[PDB]
């Protein structure tokens, strides 16, 4: 039987790549950063509170102009917030109320959302009719969508619950690329600043880097204990940190193909819902299930500060491209902007 | 503030008014969750994801029948955690899959995000169970060793008073689910066992009554009357 031979070959491959990773591990990030001045205590304060949602908020995405927002809730409404004046620019009704993701196009013309309906809907914000219309209903996934990203306003990357990701052509609506290789439900997506590489976490404690142009999985990282919930790249684009359900965040490196740091505490035993990075990548933010968001230091693996004020589960986070604001959604229908 | 800003604030006020009205209309209704195994008649309990709407005594409901997704339910169950109640349907005629149903029910009862939701049980296909146990070809004791020493609680639910072996069989199967439910839960949520025939239509009233008790219990806990 070829099964035994193939399993032995796979085991040998795993052993030799583990040895190769051990060969390059001549130091540790925590020891290298021991000589660096710590970030110290950080005290951020709520500046605005965006009321108007009447149900649990599931996703949020900052605009590329650093002023507009998109929030999705089980109420069935998509609301665009003028973050400076808290005005609701748009209120987009949804055919299906079970939405778990939202995305704001880099050009600002389009907004996307999806969830337990297996369709990624596209809304054209800037039209001469004056209202918000449905541009494309992207069907083809056999599982609930988890995260959507816009790629140059013409390509759309979607990850669903059927253990696969895809690349879409908005103009025609057909999948130009399908990404397979995950065994558990894919839960997050993140596009690198080069807009050429992206990674996805799944319910398998595995993070895989995908080449969107060729459609074949390039890298794979493992080491978490339970389901992966959120992934975001470092601003430099050569590294990324992931958040899992086992109450810890791990920082991964694409070049080193290793874990670099573990973000956990003895007093933290709750799941992690969203992860984001600062403008410089020095500050790491994570939205936990203790109704609060901690502020981790990406180089010292300590808690520089805590974001509290939500009386329910924190669901979505995000740092604006200007780096001047942080919006933290939660399950009490309240968006708070911290800076 | 300039004229553009004032007009934008007026537009935002109109948007907020519309959102408040829609939220009020949405809050005036009740939502449930439908779960069960195959061949359990979930779609015929009441006569991407299937949704059903029915109204009882000027109170309308929404059943979210999920069949599009595969057996993987551990991760998307977080959406249905603010619902009023969960309808759990079991095909009690077939004894081979009862253990799977018991295991499935236990996981949903002990689910972390489902720790405050009352579960409503619908043991379906009562007529099939009655004829199956009356034939005598298949015996429950072959699958459940506890069925022999279990005794009837000397309470007769049916009015016509059929064969007590059927009544003993029905109570034992119901007793398994009741014991599983009462093993843990701290009393935050309770089970509502029921026996529904395949052709039975008196299900909306049972759902309506059970939802009334659940909301009454919820009000008692929140109004500090405990």
């Amino acid at each position, epitope marked *: 039987s070829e099964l035994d031979q193939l399993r032995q070959e796979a085991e040998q491959l795993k052993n030799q790549i583990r040895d190769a990773r051990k060969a390059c591990a001549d130091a540790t990030l925590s020891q290298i950063t021991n000589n660096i001045d710590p970030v110290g205590r950080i005290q951020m304060r709520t500046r605005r509170t965006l009321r108007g949602h009447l149900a649990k908020i599931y996703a949020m995405h900052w605009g590329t102009d650093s002023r507009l927002l998109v929030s999705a809730s089980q109420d069935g409404k998509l609301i665009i917030w003028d973050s400076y004046t808290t*005005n609701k620019v748009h209120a987009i009704p949804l055919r299906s109320s079970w939405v778990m993701t939202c995305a704001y196009a880099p050009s600002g013309n389009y907004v996307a959302c999806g969830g337990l309906d297996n369709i990624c809907s596209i809304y054209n914000l800037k039209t*001469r*009719e*004056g209202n918000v219309r449905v541009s494309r209903e992207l069907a083809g996934h056999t599982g609930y969508l988890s995260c959507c990203r816009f790629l140059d306003d013409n390509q759309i990357v979607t990850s669903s619950g059927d253990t696969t990701c895809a690349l879409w052509d908005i103009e025609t609506g057909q999948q130009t690329t399908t990404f397979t290789g995950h065994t558990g439900d894919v839960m997050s997506l993140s596009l690198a600043p080069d807009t050429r590489l992206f990674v996805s976490g799944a319910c398998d404690a595995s993070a895989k880097l995908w080449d969107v142009r060729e459609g074949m999985c390039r890298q794979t990282f493992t080491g978490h204990e339970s389901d992966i919930n959120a992934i975001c790249f470092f601003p430099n684009g050569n590294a990324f940190a992931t958040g899992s359900d086992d109450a810890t965040c791990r920082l991964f490196d694409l070049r080193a193909d290793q874990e670099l740091m573990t973000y956990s505490h003895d007093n933290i035993i709750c799941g992690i819902t969203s992860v984001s990075f600062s403008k410089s990548g020095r500050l790491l933010l994570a939205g936990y299930d203790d109704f609060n968001c901690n502020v981790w230091d990406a180089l010292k693996a300590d808690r520089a500060g805590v974001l509290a004020g939500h009386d329910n589960r924190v669901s979505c986070l995000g740092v604006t491209d200007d780096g001047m604001a942080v919006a933290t959604g939660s399950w009490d229908s309240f968006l708070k902007i911290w800076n | 503030l*300039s*004229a*553009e*800003d*004032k007009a934008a604030v007026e537009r935002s006020k*109109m948007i907020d008014r519309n959102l408040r009205e829609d939220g009020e209309k949405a809050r005036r209704t009740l939502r449930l969750l439908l779960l069960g195994a195959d061949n359990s008649g979930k779609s015929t309990i009441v006569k991407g994801i299937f949704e059903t709407k029915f109204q009882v005594d000027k109170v309308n409901f929404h059943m979210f029948d999920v069949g599009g997704q595969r057996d993987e339910r551990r991760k998307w169950i977080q959406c249905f955690n603010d619902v009023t109640a969960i309808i759990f349907v079991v095909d009690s005629s077939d004894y081979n899959r009862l253990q799977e149903a018991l295991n499935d029910f236990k996981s949903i009862w002990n689910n972390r995000w489902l720790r405050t939701i009352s579960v409503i049980l619908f043991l379906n296909k009562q007529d099939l169970l009655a004829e199956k146990v009356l034939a005598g070809k298949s015996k429950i004791e072959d699958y459940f060793p506890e069925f022999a020493r279990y005794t009837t609680p000397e309470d007769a639910t049916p009015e016509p008073g059929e064969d007590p072996r059927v009544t003993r069989a029905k109570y034992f199967i119901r007793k398994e689910f009741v014991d599983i439910s009462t093993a843990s839960g701290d009393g935050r949520h309770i089970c509502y066992p029921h026996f529904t025939c395949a052709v039975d239509t008196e299900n909306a009233r049972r759902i309506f009554n059970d939802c009334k008790d659940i909301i009454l219990q919820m009000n008692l806990r929140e109004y500090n009357l405990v």
Partner: single-chain antibody
Amino acid sequence: DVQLVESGGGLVQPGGSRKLSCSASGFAFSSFGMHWVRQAPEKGLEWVAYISSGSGTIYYADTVKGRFTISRDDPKNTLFLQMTSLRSEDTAMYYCVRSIYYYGSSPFDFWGQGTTLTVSSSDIVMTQATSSVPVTPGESVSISCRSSKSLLHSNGNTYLYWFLQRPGQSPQLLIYRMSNLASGVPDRFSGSGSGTAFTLTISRLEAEDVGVYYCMQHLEYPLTFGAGTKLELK
């Protein structure tokens, strides 16, 4: 698909009455505020009134305050203007203008055909730099406007607007807030300026750029227009 057709023309004696109606189609009328803009044959554009979304705040011009009634019918998607106390000054051309206000909206992107009303027989003032300058196609022509007060608001937005009127056609929006080109306008027009001094720049002129250019302020009501610069082909 955006259409605006007016009605209620004819000849009226002074002191009479007339009802004007601007019918809107092809867009969400309930979400768009509307204006009335008056143009005398020999004077230029002049603001009249304004109705907000869903019959909200209503504004009237000082010269016509208390004599006109503006009504909105969202189900019918039509504007209503009531004309009372008619005089010889009101003999002019009346247009209905689409308008919408949010963070990045274009509030004067569309104009109606207009209707003809003939009658038988403080504020911010902007002065147009010139009324007539000959031009030759292929070169650049710069048009400047001045305002009696600085239009730069505390939020950083200035409210200068540029309107081009074809001979015999309704005016259109070129640039709003002196820097943003309206949709459909070719990238040959540009605007700049600060405080009270502003300029409108055209890269190269074509046969379609012959008309009269108006500078308008939207800082505070009432809205005012410039005298108008007319470009003559030469």
